Amino acid sequence: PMFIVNTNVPRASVPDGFLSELTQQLAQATGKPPQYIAVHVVPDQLMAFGGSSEPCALCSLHAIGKIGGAQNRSYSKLLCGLLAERLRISPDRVYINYYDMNAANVGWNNSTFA
Amino acid sequence: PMFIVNTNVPRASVPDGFLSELTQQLAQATGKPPQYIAVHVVPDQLMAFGGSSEPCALCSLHAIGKIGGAQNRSYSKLLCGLLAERLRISPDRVYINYYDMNAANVGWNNSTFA
Amino acid sequence: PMFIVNTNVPRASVPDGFLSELTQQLAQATGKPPQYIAVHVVPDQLMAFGGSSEPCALCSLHAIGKIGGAQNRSYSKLLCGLLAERLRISPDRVYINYYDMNAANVGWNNSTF
């Protein structure tokens, strides 16, 4: 699985442990070992949400399976909670796009997962 | 809806007011209230289009519905027009990927839109 | 087609010519003219793969058709090769998401395909 967060919160406000915390928490939520988890955080971005420049986040979560109605509702709680606590972003200023990827459409280690 | 623009144009070329303008124009085009519109502009990127480093843009528009044949032509005219006028990027050096998101695959405030 | 690579490798480690190379190699692999190939490289990123900060890459390839089982394996081999050789990123620290775009969902030159 792969999680990306794009935010206008400055780099200095992203804690040093935030990528490891995300990795561990997403491993537990998705049921996948932490070695399979990739995380990417992009601070200092020029963005707006609802026409305001207050802290906000545009995120994506891609996984081969483990994406669906109930699972996504649960991920959104987990992730809004982490972004609220660690980056101080209000949960109503967060969008997470979820992508259920087909194994044939994910490349890794010179090949794909299919 | 969310609109992201990645561009090799420098940050100083992005006019004050561009994010508001995009928010207002996209609210009008998509028929969604400005409160749900997110916009993200990423200047100074290392990119090429057709092997040339002249101004270009790689963009994305995600929405839950409001995505389709005729609508996307209209958005492309709108968006390329803004990128031409405000950032001086030729329309033929722009790509916009359109994503019709399933409400179950969009997280927002501790839940999804489904 | 458009290829984006996000990586924690520093900008100074991206060799002169890398975007031209990716353009030429992707034109060849996809069969599309180089004029329509876009490439975007984003170094110095804050990222982790498997909870480690060693060199890694998160990538995306979008194309209108030319995406599928066998083709995707061949692109992965080409692209992990390039990221290994040019950027010194191990292929087992790379993810590439492939997207088969509908022509109606790709805007260009004031209109869609």
From Swiss-Prot, chains A, B:
<dbReference type="GO" id="GO:0005125">
    <property type="term" value="F:cytokine activity"/>
</dbReference>
<dbReference type="GO" id="GO:0061078">
    <property type="term" value="P:positive regulation of prostaglandin secretion involved in immune response"/>
</dbReference>
<dbReference type="GO" id="GO:0090238">
    <property type="term" value="P:positive regulation of arachidonate secretion"/>
</dbReference>
<comment type="function">
    <text>Pro-inflammatory cytokine involved in the innate immune response to bacterial pathogens. The expression of MIF at sites of inflammation suggests a role as mediator in regulating the function of macrophages in host defense. Counteracts the anti-inflammatory activity of glucocorticoids. Has phenylpyruvate tautomerase and dopachrome tautomerase activity (in vitro), but the physiological substrate is not known. It is not clear whether the tautomerase activity has any physiological relevance, and whether it is important for cytokine activity.</text>
</comment>
<feature type="modified residue" description="N6-acetyllysine; alternate">
    <location>
        <position position="77"/>
    </location>
</feature>
<dbReference type="GO" id="GO:1904813">
    <property type="term" value="C:ficolin-1-rich granule lumen"/>
</dbReference>
<dbReference type="GO" id="GO:0008284">
    <property type="term" value="P:positive regulation of cell population proliferation"/>
</dbReference>
<dbReference type="GO" id="GO:0006954">
    <property type="term" value="P:inflammatory response"/>
</dbReference>
<dbReference type="GO" id="GO:0005829">
    <property type="term" value="C:cytosol"/>
</dbReference>
<dbReference type="GO" id="GO:0070062">
    <property type="term" value="C:extracellular exosome"/>
</dbReference>
<dbReference type="GO" id="GO:0042056">
    <property type="term" value="F:chemoattractant activity"/>
</dbReference>
<dbReference type="GO" id="GO:0031982">
    <property type="term" value="C:vesicle"/>
</dbReference>
<dbReference type="GO" id="GO:0019752">
    <property type="term" value="P:carboxylic acid metabolic process"/>
</dbReference>
<dbReference type="GO" id="GO:0031666">
    <property type="term" value="P:positive regulation of lipopolysaccharide-mediated signaling pathway"/>
</dbReference>
<dbReference type="GO" id="GO:0001819">
    <property type="term" value="P:positive regulation of cytokine production"/>
</dbReference>
<keyword id="KW-0202">Cytokine</keyword>
<protein>
    <recommendedName>
        <fullName>Macrophage migration inhibitory factor</fullName>
        <ecNumber>5.3.2.1</ecNumber>
        <ecNumber>5.3.3.12</ecNumber>
    </recommendedName>
</protein>
<dbReference type="GO" id="GO:0048146">
    <property type="term" value="P:positive regulation of fibroblast proliferation"/>
</dbReference>
<feature type="binding site">
    <location>
        <position position="64"/>
    </location>
    <ligand>
        <name>substrate</name>
    </ligand>
</feature>
<dbReference type="GO" id="GO:0070374">
    <property type="term" value="P:positive regulation of ERK1 and ERK2 cascade"/>
</dbReference>
<dbReference type="Pfam" id="PF01187">
    <property type="entry name" value="MIF"/>
</dbReference>
<dbReference type="GO" id="GO:0033033">
    <property type="term" value="P:negative regulation of myeloid cell apoptotic process"/>
</dbReference>
<dbReference type="GO" id="GO:0051248">
    <property type="term" value="P:negative regulation of protein metabolic process"/>
</dbReference>
<dbReference type="GO" id="GO:0050178">
    <property type="term" value="F:phenylpyruvate tautomerase activity"/>
</dbReference>
<dbReference type="GO" id="GO:2000343">
    <property type="term" value="P:positive regulation of chemokine (C-X-C motif) ligand 2 production"/>
</dbReference>
<dbReference type="GO" id="GO:0045087">
    <property type="term" value="P:innate immune response"/>
</dbReference>
<feature type="binding site">
    <location>
        <position position="97"/>
    </location>
    <ligand>
        <name>substrate</name>
    </ligand>
</feature>
<dbReference type="GO" id="GO:0030330">
    <property type="term" value="P:DNA damage response, signal transduction by p53 class mediator"/>
</dbReference>
<dbReference type="GO" id="GO:0005576">
    <property type="term" value="C:extracellular region"/>
</dbReference>
<dbReference type="GO" id="GO:0002020">
    <property type="term" value="F:protease binding"/>
</dbReference>
<keyword id="KW-0963">Cytoplasm</keyword>
<dbReference type="GO" id="GO:0009986">
    <property type="term" value="C:cell surface"/>
</dbReference>
<keyword id="KW-0395">Inflammatory response</keyword>
<dbReference type="GO" id="GO:2000773">
    <property type="term" value="P:negative regulation of cellular senescence"/>
</dbReference>
<dbReference type="GO" id="GO:0004167">
    <property type="term" value="F:dopachrome isomerase activity"/>
</dbReference>
<feature type="active site" description="Proton acceptor; via imino nitrogen">
    <location>
        <position position="1"/>
    </location>
</feature>
<dbReference type="GO" id="GO:0005886">
    <property type="term" value="C:plasma membrane"/>
</dbReference>
<dbReference type="GO" id="GO:0007166">
    <property type="term" value="P:cell surface receptor signaling pathway"/>
</dbReference>
<dbReference type="GO" id="GO:0005654">
    <property type="term" value="C:nucleoplasm"/>
</dbReference>
<dbReference type="GO" id="GO:0141163">
    <property type="term" value="P:positive regulation of cAMP/PKA signal transduction"/>
</dbReference>
<dbReference type="GO" id="GO:0032760">
    <property type="term" value="P:positive regulation of tumor necrosis factor production"/>
</dbReference>
<dbReference type="GO" id="GO:0043518">
    <property type="term" value="P:negative regulation of DNA damage response, signal transduction by p53 class mediator"/>
</dbReference>
